[PDB]
């Protein structure tokens, strides 16, 4: 249970699951 936020094409977005 952990969320990360990356940025690819300038858009920062949360990636959690």
Same mark, same amino acid.
């Given at each position: 249970?952990? /969320?990360? $936020?990356? %940025? &690819? $094409?300038?858009? /920062? &977005?949360? $990636? %959690?699951?």
């Amino acid at each position: 249970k952990w /969320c990360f $936020r990356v %940025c &690819y $094409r300038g858009i /920062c &977005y949360r $990636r %959690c699951r």
